[model samples]
Target: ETLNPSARIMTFYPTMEEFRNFSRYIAYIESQGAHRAGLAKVVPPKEWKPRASYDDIDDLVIPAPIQQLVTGQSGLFTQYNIQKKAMTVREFRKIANSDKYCTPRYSEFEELERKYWKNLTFNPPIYGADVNGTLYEKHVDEWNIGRLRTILDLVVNTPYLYFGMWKTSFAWHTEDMDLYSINYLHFGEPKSWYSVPPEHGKRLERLAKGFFPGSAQSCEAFLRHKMTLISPLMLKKYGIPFDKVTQEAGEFMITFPYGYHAGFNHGFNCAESTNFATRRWIEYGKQAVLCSCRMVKISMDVFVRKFQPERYKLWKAGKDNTVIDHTLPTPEAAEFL
Candidate 1:
C-alpha cells in the first residue's frame, strides 16, 4: 500500500463545440462506463476558458465560515473552530495557499489539518439558472441541474460554491437522493479526488460498517453526515478498488449515481457543484435506499405523483399500470398529508 500506483482518471478533452453540449458529453461518458471509476475529469478544449472572476465576484469580500481541520500523524483527521470566525473569502484564499501549508510522505497522517470554506449556495444565483435546450452564453451546460429542481424544492439542486486551501477535504459519501452530480473547479490550484464506482458502493458501506460500528448500529445513513475520511492508502490496503483524479481549474468532475467520492484541495481554489438528473437517474432514484438520508425522508412515488404528473400519467396510461403504488407512509403523514 505504500507505493500502490493510482489508476489514472479518465479524462475527456472536448473541443469548444463539444464542450458547449457538455450535457451530451457527460451522457456519452456514462454510456462508456466512466462511472466505473466513480468520477471523470473533463478538461475543456484549450481555446475555451471560463471568465475567472477571481479579482471580482459580488461575494469575494463577503465573510464565511472557515473551519480548521487538524490532522495527526496516524492519518486520522478532526475539525473544529474556536468560534465563529467567518473570514472574508479573499482573505481565506490568500491564507490557504500561503507558504505556511505543507505536505509529506510517511506522514503517518495522524490527522490531516486543512482549511475549508464551503456550502456557499445562492438565493438569486450569480450565474443564470435557466436551462433552455441550447448552448449557454459563457460556461458549459454542466451547471444545469435539470427539471427536478423546478417543481420540487431546490435542495441539492442549486450549485454550492466551495473554497479550499491545501489539505482541505470533503469526506466520503454519495450525493443526495443518489443523483448524478457535476463539480467544476472554477479557479485556483488543482483538487485531487478518490472515488469508488457505483458497483462497489455496498462494499464500501460494509467496510464503513466495520470501521464505524457505533454509527453503523444507530443509522445506516451516518456516513452521509460526512463524519469520516478513509485515506486512499487505507482503502488500497483494505482491498477496495478506488480511483484518483486531480482536477485543475477549468475542468469538470462528474460523479455518477451511487458513486462514492471524496477529496482534498491542493491549495487555494474555488469550485461549484450541483446534482442533476436524467431519464437514467430516475431509475436509480426508483430503487434508491431510504432511511439513509441525513435530511428529510424522500418519496419517489410522491415525487412522480406531484411534481412529475405528466410522467405519472404517461406511466399510468401504459397497460401494465405497474409503477405507481404507495408503500410506507411516515408517522407525520397520519396527521398531515
Candidate 2:
C-alpha cells in the first residue's frame, strides 16, 4: 500500500579516500548516533564506478539455491527452505519474473561459485571490512564461538556475492549475531529495503508469534528461519515503527546492531556484502540475547571461557566515544532530504 513513509536513512557522499577506510567511516557514522536509527545509506562518489564490466555474465552459471515456502497460515507469511541448484543468469531472470512462492535467487557466493571479484577495483584498498579486525584495536569477536576458531570464518566473516531479480527476496532477519552489515550493489536494478529499529525489534518478534505460531514453536529463532513477511500496512496498523529505502548499483546499505531488515530486488542484478563489528559492539554482544529465554546462536559465554584472560582485558579496554545524535539535523540536509 506504500502507506509508511521512508525512514531518514542518512545518505552521505564520502570522498573516495574516506570510502577506502570504510571501517572508520562506519565508526564515525555510528558515533553520530545514526546507529540509533539502526540504518544508513552510503553513496559512493558519483564519479566512481566499478572497473570490471558486467557484460556477458548472463551465460555464467553457478549454484544458486532456490527456496520454496513449505507452509503458511496467512497469504503474506510463510516458511522457506533452500534447495541447492545451479542456475544461469538468464535462467534466474526467467524464473524470478514468473515464479510463485518467492523462491530465493541466493546469497553467500564464494570463490568456487564465481570469479567476478575484479569489479570492486574502483574502491580503495582495505575495502573489505572484517569483524576479526578491530575498529579501535579491540579484539572480542562473537563469531569466534570457541577458542579453536574452526568454523564461522568462511560464512560469517568472509564477503559473499548475491544475485537477485524481480521478486527474489531475503526475508526479515538480523545478522547472525545482530552484527552490523554492509551491502554494495555492483550492478543491477535498485534493491528495496524495509527495516525496523532495534528498540522495536522485540515487539516485531511478538507480532511474529501470532502470525507464525507453527514456526515459533519448532524454531529457536523464528525470524532467522527466513519464512515470513508482514505487509507495511499490517506493521503500521499494529503501530510498529517502520522504515524503508532504495539502493541502486554502486550504492551501499549499512545496518546497525540488532536492526531487523528485509528486502527484494526490483530486477536482475548482482551484489556483494559482509558482516562487521566494532569496539562498541562487544558491550552489545555480552548483554544482547545472551541470556534470553529463547536462544538463537552462539553466546559470549563460550569465547570468554575458550580464550585467554588477557584477551578479556583488551575487550574491556575497547572504547567508542560518542559525540552526536542523528535526531538533530546535519548541515545542508534539511531542505533537500
Candidate 3:
C-alpha cells in the first residue's frame, strides 16, 4: 500500500469550522480534568544554590509575562509554564496570594489570567498507586497481554481523528523516538514548539543562553515538552539545511529518534483536546463501551512536567516502552534517510 501523507496545519488564524471544533474541543478538555492547580515560587534546591539562583525570578523572557511576575524575589502566578512542566499542589498553589508582593499592578495580571492559571479545571488520569482509573484487575483486563488494548482500539477506530491534544500541559522527553504519546487539546492555544538541527547543537546552546539566563541554573526548561524536526520546513525556517519534505497536504508528528524540540502551549480556548483522543482510540480498537468509557482520566495540570537534566536519561531508557502506531502520516517522511 502506498503511504498516505497529510498536512500539518500551521494556522495563525483558525477558520470558522476549526473554531467550532475548537469550541467542542475546549468543552471536552474541561470534561477531562484539564486545569491549573495554582502558582509557585520555584526556589532552587540547596544543592543547586551554589551554582544556580539567578535564573529563577526574572530570566526567561519568551513567555514575557513570567519575566514580569518572576522578577527578583517576590512571586506572581500565570500560565507561562503550563506546558513543558507540571507542579505539585503545594508547588502549584504556593503562589496562591503571593503575586501581590511582586508588583504593584498585580490586579491586571491576576484578573487577566483569572480563568487560566487560577481557574483551570483538572482531573488526573493516574491516581493513587498509579491506578488506571479502575480497579487493579480492571486495569489489567482493559489491556490485552502486554500491548495496551485500549490504545490499539483508539488507533483503528479513531482514524482521521487526532489524539495527543489535552494529554498534558507538556510532553515527556524521549530521545531516539522511543516513547509513545497521544493527546488532544480541548480549548485555547497552549502548545508552542521549536526544533534544533543535530549538527547545530551550538545553535541550541546559543538559544539556551537566552532561555533563562542564570548561574547553576541547568536548563531543564529545554527538555520538558515534545518536539519534532522531521519536516524540512522547520529546518529551513530555522536556517538549517536538510532534505526537503513537501507539505502540500500532510501531517507532522514527531517520534524524535534523536533531536531536541521545546514548547509550552498548543493554543486553544476551552482546552478540551481529549474527548476526541479517547473516543478515537477506542473506536480504533473496536472495543466494548465498558472498556472504552470515553472518560478523560488525568487532570490537565497533572500532566505538567518539570525534570532535571538527568530526566532525559530516564526518558531514553523508557522510550521504547511507550509507542504509538500513528493513524495519520507525517509529511515527506519517505524522503528522509
Candidate 4:
C-alpha cells in the first residue's frame, strides 16, 4: 500500500554551525543512559503485532526492560531487524566502544552475536522531551516548507527521534498520513535505505502475494505484521524500479508524500525524523487515508481552516496562488470535524 518510485534519497551534511551544536547534543543524550531513554520491545517475526486492530496499535509495543542490556548476560533477542528492541544509552556506548562486541561473528559466535543485536531498541526523541525543545527545534523547523507563513502547519502530528545500533531496522512502510518526512543522521556509521515509488505500490503488493501463499485472497494477510525481508535484488528481479542510498553521519534525507521507504542502521547511529504537510499534499493525504492499512486520524480540516484565510489573501493580491479546496476533510477525522 506504500511505495514511491520517484522517491530519491539525497544526502547533505550539516552546516558548520549545526555540526558543533548537534554533535554536543548527541553526546549529552547518550551520556544520560537509560535514565533519560524510553524502551520498546523487539519481537520475533512470527509474533509481531499480528492482525493488529487500529485501536490496539500503541498497545502492541511496550517499554522494554532498560536495565537488562548491561548485565553482559544473554537476553531475549529477535532476528537481525532493528528498531524493534530495547537498549539504553549506557548499553549502546559499551557496545560501540568495543570492536569485539560490534564485529560480525563466525559459527558459534555468530549465533550469539545475532541474539545480542536483537534485544535492544531505544526511545526516539519525543515531543515535550528535552529532545524536541532546543536542538531539534532549531534545525528541522528552519528548512521546513510545511511551516511557511501562509501554509497550515501540521508538524505536531508527527513527532519522532531515531536512535539505534548495528542491525537495527525499520520495515517497509510509508510515513503516516502520507505527509512529507525529513530524517537527519546526527552521527555514527551510515544507514542503508531502499525506496519504491507510489505508482509501483500495487504491483509490489501483488508480488508480495506470491511470497506468502493465500495472501492473494486478502491484503490483510499480507500485512499481518512487519514484513519479512525483501531484498533490493528481489525487487529488481520483478522489474520494479527502485533506488538505494547510504546516508552518512550529519546528513539529511527527505521522503515525499506517496514514497515508500525502509532502512537499517549500518552501526550505532542517532537520527531524528518528523512528518509535515503543505497545500499540495492535501489530495495525496486523502488518498493515503482511503487506502491506508488501518484507521488514520490526522486532522486535515485543521490545516484547511488555517490555510483558507491566507489563501484568499494571496488570491486577492493577484499573486500566483493555487489554493487547496477546504471541503476535503481527512476520512476518519471528517465525522469529528
Candidate No. with top TM-score: 1
Error of 3 at 84 (Å): 17
Better of 1 and 3 by lDDT: 1
List the lowest-lDDT window of 10 residues for candidate 4: 34-43
TM, every model: 0.70, 0.67, 0.25, 0.54
Most accurate candidate by lDDT: 1
Tens digit of per-residue lDDT, candidate 1, span 16-130: 6766654556656554446566677887777664453456553343234445444333333333322234555656655564555433222322233222212111110111111
- Going through the candidates in the order shown, the clash numbers are 14, 0, 74, 16
TM-score of 1: 0.70
**Residue-level lDDT tens digits of model 3 in 22-133:** 2243223222222110000111112211111222422211111111111111111111222223222233223321342211233432232332233222321110011012
- Candidate 4 residue lDDT tens string, 99-205: 63353443553353344344333322111111231123333434332232323244343334454555555655665666656575655666667776555555666
Clashing pairs in 2: none
lDDT pick, better of 2 and 3: 2
Q: Cα lDDT of model 4 overall?
A: 0.44
For model 1, what is the error of residue 214's alpha carbon versus the real structure, in angstroms, after optimal superposition? 0.9
Q: How high is the lDDT of residue 102 in model 2?
A: 31
